[PDB]
Scaffold this motif. Structure first.
Motif, mmCIF file in Angstrom:
data_model
loop_
_atom_site.group_PDB
_atom_site.id
_atom_site.type_symbol
_atom_site.label_atom_id
_atom_site.label_comp_id
_atom_site.label_asym_id
_atom_site.label_seq_id
_atom_site.Cartn_x
_atom_site.Cartn_y
_atom_site.Cartn_z
ATOM 1 N N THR A 142 14.240 10.096 3.849
ATOM 2 C CA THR A 142 14.918 9.633 2.662
ATOM 3 C C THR A 142 13.966 8.718 2.148
ATOM 4 O OG1 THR A 142 16.491 10.574 4.138
ATOM 5 C CG2 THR A 142 17.158 10.133 2.085
ATOM 6 N N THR A 143 13.378 8.774 1.211
ATOM 7 C CA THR A 143 12.552 7.628 0.530
ATOM 8 C C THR A 143 12.196 6.162 0.519
ATOM 9 O OG1 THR A 143 13.885 7.865 -1.336
ATOM 10 C CG2 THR A 143 12.392 9.968 -1.120
ATOM 11 N N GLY A 144 12.154 5.331 0.719
ATOM 12 C CA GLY A 144 11.500 4.492 2.069
ATOM 13 C C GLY A 144 11.981 3.294 -0.002
ATOM 14 N N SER A 145 11.534 2.114 0.667
ATOM 15 C CA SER A 145 11.162 1.399 -0.713
ATOM 16 C C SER A 145 9.902 0.398 0.246
ATOM 17 C CB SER A 145 12.058 -0.290 -0.490
ATOM 18 O OG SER A 145 12.221 -0.631 0.954
ATOM 19 N N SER A 146 9.503 0.979 0.905
ATOM 20 C CA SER A 146 7.608 0.710 1.372
ATOM 21 C C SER A 146 8.237 1.705 2.242
ATOM 22 C CB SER A 146 7.923 -0.445 2.020
ATOM 23 O OG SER A 146 8.092 -0.703 3.072
ATOM 24 N N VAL A 147 6.709 2.330 2.625
ATOM 25 C CA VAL A 147 6.347 3.351 2.925
ATOM 26 C C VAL A 147 5.152 2.810 3.702
ATOM 27 C CG1 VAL A 147 4.943 5.709 2.820
ATOM 28 C CG2 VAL A 147 5.838 4.276 0.702
ATOM 29 N N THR A 148 5.274 3.369 5.298
ATOM 30 C CA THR A 148 4.310 3.414 6.249
ATOM 31 C C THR A 148 2.846 4.411 6.518
ATOM 32 O OG1 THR A 148 5.310 3.916 8.195
ATOM 33 C CG2 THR A 148 5.023 1.206 7.896
ATOM 34 N N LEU A 149 2.214 4.792 6.627
ATOM 35 C CA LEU A 149 0.608 5.059 6.686
ATOM 36 C C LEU A 149 0.473 5.122 7.789
ATOM 37 C CD1 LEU A 149 -0.009 4.866 3.288
ATOM 38 C CD2 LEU A 149 0.845 7.493 4.703
ATOM 39 N N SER A 167 -11.474 1.001 2.083
ATOM 40 C CA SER A 167 -12.992 0.213 1.830
ATOM 41 C C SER A 167 -12.747 -1.053 2.043
ATOM 42 C CB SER A 167 -13.952 1.111 1.262
ATOM 43 O OG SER A 167 -12.878 2.390 0.757
ATOM 44 N N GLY A 168 -11.424 -1.477 2.340
ATOM 45 C CA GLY A 168 -11.176 -3.166 2.197
ATOM 46 C C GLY A 168 -10.534 -3.219 1.328
ATOM 47 N N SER A 169 -8.889 -3.689 1.739
ATOM 48 C CA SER A 169 -8.569 -4.129 0.849
ATOM 49 C C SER A 169 -6.966 -4.619 1.099
ATOM 50 C CB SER A 169 -7.639 -3.246 -0.036
ATOM 51 O OG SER A 169 -7.207 -2.353 -0.102
ATOM 52 N N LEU A 170 -6.747 -3.566 1.619
ATOM 53 C CA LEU A 170 -4.983 -3.612 3.035
ATOM 54 C C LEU A 170 -5.114 -4.243 3.579
ATOM 55 C CD1 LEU A 170 -4.307 0.032 1.749
ATOM 56 C CD2 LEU A 170 -3.460 -1.991 0.399
ATOM 57 N N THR A 193 1.192 -0.737 5.591
ATOM 58 C CA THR A 193 2.320 -0.227 4.544
ATOM 59 C C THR A 193 2.105 -1.091 3.730
ATOM 60 O OG1 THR A 193 3.665 -0.590 6.362
ATOM 61 C CG2 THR A 193 5.032 -0.971 5.182
ATOM 62 N N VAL A 194 2.480 -0.042 2.066
ATOM 63 C CA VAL A 194 3.090 -0.817 1.230
ATOM 64 C C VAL A 194 4.040 -0.469 0.096
ATOM 65 C CG1 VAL A 194 0.185 -0.858 0.574
ATOM 66 C CG2 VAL A 194 1.788 1.893 0.512
ATOM 67 N N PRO A 195 5.114 -0.847 -0.793
ATOM 68 C CA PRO A 195 5.869 0.103 -1.760
ATOM 69 C C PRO A 195 5.954 1.257 -1.378
ATOM 70 C CG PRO A 195 5.217 -1.687 -2.777
ATOM 71 C CD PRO A 195 3.906 -2.051 -1.537
ATOM 72 N N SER A 196 6.783 2.250 -1.870
ATOM 73 C CA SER A 196 6.759 3.474 -3.110
ATOM 74 C C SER A 196 6.061 3.350 -4.601
ATOM 75 C CB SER A 196 7.575 3.894 -3.318
ATOM 76 O OG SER A 196 8.402 3.438 -4.275
ATOM 77 N N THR A 198 3.446 1.995 -4.907
ATOM 78 C CA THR A 198 1.340 2.056 -4.874
ATOM 79 C C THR A 198 1.055 3.394 -4.115
ATOM 80 O OG1 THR A 198 2.143 -0.104 -3.775
ATOM 81 C CG2 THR A 198 -0.544 1.044 -3.837
ATOM 82 N N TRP A 199 2.387 4.505 -3.365
ATOM 83 C CA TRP A 199 2.325 5.698 -3.221
ATOM 84 C C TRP A 199 3.172 6.854 -3.072
ATOM 85 C CZ3 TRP A 199 3.809 8.805 0.774
ATOM 86 C CH2 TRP A 199 2.652 9.795 1.047
ATOM 87 N N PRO A 200 2.907 8.298 -3.226
ATOM 88 C CA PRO A 200 1.613 9.005 -3.534
ATOM 89 C C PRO A 200 0.904 8.870 -4.888
ATOM 90 C CG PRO A 200 3.293 10.566 -3.380
ATOM 91 C CD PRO A 200 4.079 9.056 -3.157
#
Lengths: 221, 214
Positions: A142-149, A167-170, A193-196, A198-200
């Motif tokens: 149910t579509t969070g405020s940040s996303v774990t991948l 490739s180096g950033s996060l 983990t990034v906010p929605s 930034t992904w998909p």
């Protein structure tokens, strides 16, 4: 001054036999006994034996007499420890440790200078390469405020896997849960983990690269 | 053999406090007790030797005291550089035994697990398996219990899980929980549920997804 340089890790097959080293500088090698201490991971430290390169004494812990040989090169200030008939339970970390200048009885010594440690994994299992899976959000989650991948990196040997998001950033937000060999096979995971925002929407990619296999797996997520 | 018992396995503490790590030998070991400090990433170092004597460069903040079978290490005014594992050992008899250690963690304000369930991916299914994984992430304290429900029924079966060190940067703990099914075990159930019980909640956070709903 005073430093005890060790040998550099080794991976060995079962039933085999190592000899580790302990280059000692700073002082006169011959007047201070050298001890060998083992450490199984998250178990206590443990005493194997003691040798003095100039008084002519050896004492070994009784359960180690069987598989151990403490020897010495008095002219290269080196001490070696031959561990023979190498099993699974022998896989640990081995510190040599300069005892202090007195002798050895009702103490008269304590380990006043330790080595960097030498690791020894013992496995009769060949080089298997990693299996880089994408683990991407549950359906209906149910579509969070940040996303774990996360990347599951099932099965591999030896160790030294890298994981690298984008490739180096996060560099923060990322957690490398340590690998843990089930049956011969290591296994690892990493999350990001990034906010929605930034992904998909964007390109998150996982970058596993286990060099002793000559592997480089990338994965779109 | 002298069996030395570090009664305290893991010890949590705020900065600037007084901690007392504590060691008990089985024989009276006549004050031949030494304390070694293992830092993160391997480094072991001698602090105290002969119960209470300090070693060269060990800060006055450390001190010991004991006699016969009970001995104790005091870190008066805890600094950041004391996060480590403290080991003690006897020196009365041979072989020289040691304690199992006592790890200091840092106490920080409570944190709740940012939990995440993860479905089995097509590529592993094509490979013939199923790994449902769960990230119980960034939380304090170290105490947590996770619980799997393949449909309404709980399953401790193939849940191999990786715990973690107290983070260098934010003092929290994270945790992986892999449930490892086969393409048909998975293919015979719909909702999958990772479930967490933590200090910071009177409500069980539950994490789910429905297999075919996708």
């Amino acid at each position: 001054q005073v430093q005890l340089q060790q040998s550099g890790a080794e991976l060995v097959r079962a039933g085999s036999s190592v000899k580790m080293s302990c280059k000692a500088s700073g002082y006169t090698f011959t007047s201070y006994g050298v001890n060998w201490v083992k450490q199984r991971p998250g178990q206590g430290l443990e005493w194997i034996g003691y040798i003095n390169p100039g008084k002519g004494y050896l004492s070994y812990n009784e359960k180690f007499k069987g598989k151990t040989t403490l020897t010495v090169d008095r002219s290269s200030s080196t001490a070696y420890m031959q561990l023979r008939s190498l099993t699974s339970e022998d896989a640990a970390v081995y510190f040599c440790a300069r005892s202090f200048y007195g002798g050895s009885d009702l103490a008269v010594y304590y380990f006043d200078s330790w080595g960097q440690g030498t690791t020894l994994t013992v496995s009769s299992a060949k080089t298997t390469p990693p299996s880089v899976y994408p683990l991407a959000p549950g359906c209906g989650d149910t579509t969070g405020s940040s996303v774990t991948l996360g990347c599951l990196v099932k099965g591999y040997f030896p160790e030294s896997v890298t994981v690298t998001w984008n490739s180096g950033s996060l560099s923060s937000s990322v957690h490398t849960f340590p690998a843990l060999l089930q049956s011969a096979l290591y296994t690892m995971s990493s999350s990001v983990t990034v906010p929605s925002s930034t992904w998909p929407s964007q390109t998150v990619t996982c970058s596993v690269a286990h060099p002793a296999s000559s592997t480089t797996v990338d994965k779109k997520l | 053999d002298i069996q030395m018992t570090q009664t305290t396995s893991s010890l949590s503490a705020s900065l600037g406090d007084r901690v007392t790590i504590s060691c008990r030998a089985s024989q009276d070991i006549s004050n031949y007790l030494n304390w070694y400090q293992q830092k993160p990433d391997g480094t072991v170092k001698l602090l105290i030797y002969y119960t209470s004597r300090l070693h060269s460069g060990v800060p006055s903040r450390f001190s010991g005291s004991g006699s016969g079978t009970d001995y104790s290490l005091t870190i008066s005014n805890l600094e950041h550089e004391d996060i480590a594992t403290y080991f003690c050992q006897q020196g009365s008899t041979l072989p020289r035994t040691f304690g199992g250690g006592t790890k200091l963690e840092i106490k920080r304000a409570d944190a709740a697990p940012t939990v995440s369930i993860f479905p089995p991916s097509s590529e592993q299914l094509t490979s013939g398996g199923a790994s449902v994984v769960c990230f119980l992430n960034n939380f304090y304290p170290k105490d947590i219990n996770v619980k799997w429900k393949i449909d309404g029924s709980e399953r401790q079966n193939g849940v191999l899980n990786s715990w973690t060190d107290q983070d260098s940067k934010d003092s929290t703990y994270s945790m992986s929980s892999t449930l490892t099914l086969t393409k048909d075990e998975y293919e015979r159930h719909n909702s999958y549920t990772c479930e967490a019980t933590h200090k910071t909640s009177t409500s069980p956070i539950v994490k789910s997804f429905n297999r075919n709903e996708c």
